[PDB]
Design a protein around this ligand. Structure first.
Ligand code: UTP
Ligand code: MG
Ligand code: ZN
Length: 363
C-alpha cells in the first residue's frame, strides 16, 4: 500500500507501553479513593468505577499523562426536564418516593443541584487526598467550565486525572435519543434493543457560560454504549478475534484520531484547530460504521479505502457543517454556535492536502 498505513499503526502502537504503565498508577490511586468513599457514610457511598472511555476501548493512543475516570452513582426515580430545544442539557428532578431521597442534601427548589453535589464531592475528595499527602498527590484548583475534580499525581509519573461524577438512571432513554443509535443495519435490531435497555448517565455540564441556573444542568452520557459498539463491532461475533476474521474498523478510528493529533502538532494547536477533539472523529466514525455496515467492507486488506472513507465523510461534515451526536441526533456538534466557519475551513483544507499527498503528517 502506498500510504503504508500498517507502518503508521506500528508507530502509534509504540505509545502503548507508556499508556499502560501510567494507567496502573491511575488505577492504584482511584481504587484507594473508591475504597474510602465506599467505606464511608456519605451519599457517595454507592459510587463505583465506570470503566469506559478511550483507554478501556483500547483506542487511547496518546497523552499518557492525561486520563479521565468516571464514578457512577445509582440514582433512583429520576425525571428529566430539558433545558432548551436540543436535548444537550437537562435539569434533574425526582419522581415521588415513599422511601425517601438519599440525595436530599443536594436538592434546591425541585431540582438536583449540580454545584451543590460537586462541591460536596470535591470536598470529600480533597479531604481523602490531604490524608495521603505524603504520596505526592494533590487536587488541582477549580477550572472554568470543568465539572471535574482533577487529581495531580506527581510520583512515580506526572499524571493529571479528571474525576467525573456520573448519575446512573436505570430508566427509559429520554425522548431526545429516540432516533439515536442508528445501528439496526450494522449490528441488528436485537443488539439495538439490548443496548437501549441499559441505563443512561448524567454528567454535570454548564449550558452556557453565564451565571445562573445554567450552572445546574446535566448532559447525557452513553460512554458505556460507545465502549460496547467499539468492542463488539462486527456483524459476526468473531470479528477481529483469534478464530475469526480481522477487520480494520478500530484501526481506522485510531488513524482518524492520530490524523487530528498530528495536524495539531504540525500547526501548533492554533486557534482554528483548538476546538476539534477526538470525540468529533469518534462520532464521524460511528456514522461511517452505519453507512458501511458489513464486515467484508472493512477487511484488513481494504485499509486504505476504509480509512479514506472515514476521512471523506469527516470532510463532508466539515463542509456541510453537520455532525450529529450519534445518540442525540438533534444535537449538532458542528453548529456555528460551537465552531466558527473559518475553523472548519482551515481543517478541511489541511485534510484535503493530506489526503491528496498520502498523509505526510503521519511521518
Ligand atoms: O457525549 C459527549 C461525550 C464526550 N464529550 C467530550 O469529549 C471529551 C472526551 O470525551 P470522552 O472521555 O467521553 O471520550 P473519549 O474517552 O473516547 O475521548 P478521549 O478521552 O480520548 O479524549 C470530553 O472533554 C467531553 O467534553 C462531549 O462533548 N459529549
Ligand atoms: Mg475520555
Ligand atoms: Zn473487527
Amino acid at each position: 500500500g502506498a500510504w503504508k498505513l500498517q507502518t503508521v499503526l506500528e508507530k502509534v502502537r509504540l505509545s502503548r507501553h507508556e499508556i499502560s504503565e501510567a494507567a496502573e498508577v491511575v488505577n492504584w490511586v482511584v481504587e484507594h479513593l473508591l475504597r474510602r468513599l465506599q467505606g464511608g457514610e456519605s451519599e457517595f457511598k454507592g459510587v463505583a468505577l465506570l470503566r469506559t472511555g478511550s483507554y478501556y476501548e483500547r483506542v487511547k493512543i496518546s497523552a499518557p499523562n492525561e486520563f479521565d475516570v468516571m464514578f457512577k452513582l445509582e440514582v433512583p426515580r429520576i425525571q428529566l426536564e430539558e433545558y432548551c430545544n436540543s436535548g444537550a442539557h437537562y435539569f434533574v428532578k425526582f419522581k415521588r418516593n415513599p422511601g425517601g431521597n438519599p440525595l436530599e442534601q443536594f436538592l434546591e427548589k425541585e431540582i438536583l443541584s449540580a454545584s451543590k453535589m460537586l462541591s460536596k464531592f470535591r470536598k470529600i475528595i480533597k479531604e481523602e487526598i490531604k490524608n495521603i499527602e505524603d504520596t505526592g498527590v494533590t487536587v488541582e484548583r477549580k477550572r472554568r467550565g470543568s465539572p471535574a475534580v482533577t487529581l495531580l499525581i506527581s510520583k512515580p509519573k506526572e499524571i493529571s486525572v479528571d474525576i467525573i461524577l456520573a448519575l446512573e438512571s436505570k430508566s427509559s432513554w429520554p425522548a431526545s435519543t429516540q432516533k439515536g443509535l442508528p445501528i439496526s443495519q450494522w449490528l441488528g435490531a436485537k443488539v439495538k434493543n439490548n443496548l437501549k435497555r441499559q441505563p443512561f448517565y448524567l454528567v454535570p455540564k454548564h449550558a452556557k457560560e453565564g451565571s445562573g441556573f445554567q450552572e445546574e444542568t446535566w448532559r447525557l452520557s452513553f460512554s458505556h454504549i460507545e465502549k460496547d459498539i467499539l468492542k463488539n463491532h462486527g456483524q459476526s461475533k468473531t470479528c477481529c478475534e483469534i478464530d475469526g476474521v480481522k477487520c480494520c474498523r478500530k484501526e481506522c478510528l485510531k488513524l482518524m484520531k492520530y490524523l487530528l493529533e498530528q495536524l495539531k502538532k504540525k500547526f501548533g494547536n492554533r486557534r482554528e484547530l483548538a476546538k476539534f477533539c477526538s470525540y468529533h472523529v469518534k462520532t464521524a466514525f460511528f456514522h461511517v460504521c452505519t453507512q458501511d455496515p458489513h464486515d467484508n467492507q472493512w477487511h484488513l486488506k481494504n485499509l486504505e479505502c476504509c480509512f479514506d472513507n472515514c476521512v471523506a465523510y469527516f470532510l463532508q461534515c466539515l463542509k456541510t457543517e453537520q455532525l450529529a451526536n450519534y445518540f442525540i441526533p438533534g444535537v449538532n456538534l458542528f453548529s456555528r454556535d460551537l465552531i466558527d466557519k473559518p475553523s472548519k475551513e482551515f481543517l478541511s483544507k489541511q485534510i484535503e492536502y493530506e489526503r491528496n499527498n498520502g498523509f505526510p503528517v503521519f511521518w
